[PDB]
Design a protein around this ligand. Structure first.
Ligand SMILES: Nc1nc2c([nH]c(=O)n2[C@H]2C[C@H](O)[C@@H](COP(=O)(O)OP(=O)(O)OP(=O)(O)O)O2)c(=O)[nH]1
Ligand SMILES: [Mn+2]
Ligand SMILES: [Mn+2]
Ligand SMILES: [Mn+2]
Length: 156
């Protein structure tokens, strides 16, 4: 049994493009990703996701929808990362670079998988198909998956 810490991840997914951010420092630096971070005390997971989206991309959204949950384990780290994944298609301002992230739109036939976390190759296609999912990935360092599970689910 391991303890887990709550994180969020938000994908702004439109009909033909997705907004990603290049992580400029910290965890996962150098990889394109959705926006997110730790959930803080007192806020719902969805509201923490909205907050991180605003902080890292400048975008303010009224609502998100849950699309998946992914648990990450790292060799040498006792704490699991419990990542709650959300989407929205509906925005009304422009993305702006933050200290954490440089936002960029990608067409949906140009998803930059080689410059994303390796696990994203497995679950991101489900997100694109509008399937909901649960995943688990064990990493050695940043690059190497030692074990993983991925399951489509009816409810996140
Ligand atoms: N796509 C993808 N995202 C991941 C993976 N692992 C992982 O932690 N994430 C996400 C969850 C969070 O959005 C982010 C990690 O949190 P973070 O370090 O940005 O937290 P934060 O913004 O609060 O950190 P900080 O500003 O205090 O430095 O990366 C992964 O394998 N794939
Ligand atoms: Mn953040
Ligand atoms: Mn972050
Ligand atoms: Mn934060």
């Amino acid at each position: 049994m391991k303890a887990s810490r709550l994180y969020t991840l938000v994908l702004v997914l439109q009909p033909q493009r997705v907004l990603l951010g290049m992580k400029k420092r910290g965890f996962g630096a150098g990889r394109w990703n959705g926006f997110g971070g730790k959930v803080q005390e007192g806020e719902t997971i969805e509201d923490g996701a909205r907050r991180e989206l605003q902080e890292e991309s400048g975008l303010t959204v009224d609502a998100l929808h849950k699309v998946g949950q992914i648990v990450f384990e790292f060799v040498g780290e006792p704490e699991l990362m419990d990542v709650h994944v959300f989407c929205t298609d509906s925005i009304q301002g422009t993305p702006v670079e933050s200290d954490e992230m440089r936002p960029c739109w990608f067409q949906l036939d140009q998803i930059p998988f080689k410059d994303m976390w390796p696990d994203d190759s497995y679950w991101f296609p489900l997100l694109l198909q509008k399937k909901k999912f649960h995943g688990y990935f064990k990493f050695q360092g940043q690059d190497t998956i030692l074990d993983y599970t991925l399951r489509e689910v009816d409810t996140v």
